[PDB]
Amino acid sequence: SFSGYLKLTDNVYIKNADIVEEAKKVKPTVVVNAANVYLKHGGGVAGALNKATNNAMQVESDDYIATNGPLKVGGSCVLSGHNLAKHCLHVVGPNVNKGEDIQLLKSAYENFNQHEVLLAPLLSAGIFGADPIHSLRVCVDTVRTNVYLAVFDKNLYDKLVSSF
């Protein structure tokens, strides 16, 4: 079960943690992946989660895309959590580094409301280029279900908590 999290709101918790190590420890019902529309888990959170599954996440994802086509920015799909969780909710936040509308970040977080409890990264943060302080703000103002945020960088985690 989730431990060592700092409570930010009624339903939002945060921890300086590697989401892969956190998923391996917690084995949550849902781990959120910071996905792209093609489910190409190359780097960032997606690359790390996929590597932890021995590429099984990518094999499953390629079958999903072959059948369904790409996701929408702001959208999601539920796939297996493999060895990390029961399910992985692949959520596509806007990639500011590809010029995508930051306004889609709230739509991306709305996917979390379909799950009672989730282990997640900050959407659109990291290699997706958005301000993580903004991402946390949208998370707290959009997600109503119980979200346990894992923030990999200690320095960013401290900035997020101290500026909340």
SS3 38: coil
Does 19 participate in binding ligand W0V (rule CB under 6 A)? yes
Residues 43-102 interacting with ligand W0V (rule: CB under 6 A): 44-45, 48, 51-52
**Nearest residue (CB) to ligand W0V, 55 versus 103:** 55
| End-to-end CA gap in the chain | 25
What is the DSSP annotation of 52-106?
HTTTHHHHHHHHHHHHH----TT-EEEEE-TTT-SEEEEE----GGGT--TTHHH
**Distance (Å, whole) CA 95 – CA 156:** 19
Size of the site for ligand W0V (CB under 6 A): 11
Does 152 participate in binding ligand W0V (rule CB under 6 A)? yes
CB of 66 to ligand W0V, least distance (A): 26
**Distance (Å, whole) CA 117 – CA 94:** 23
CB of 145 to ligand W0V, least distance (A): 21
Interacting residue with ligand W0V among 21, 60, 62, 110 (CB under 6 A): 21
| Chain residues in the site for ligand W0V (CB under 6 A) | 18-21, 44-45, 48, 51-52, 126, 152
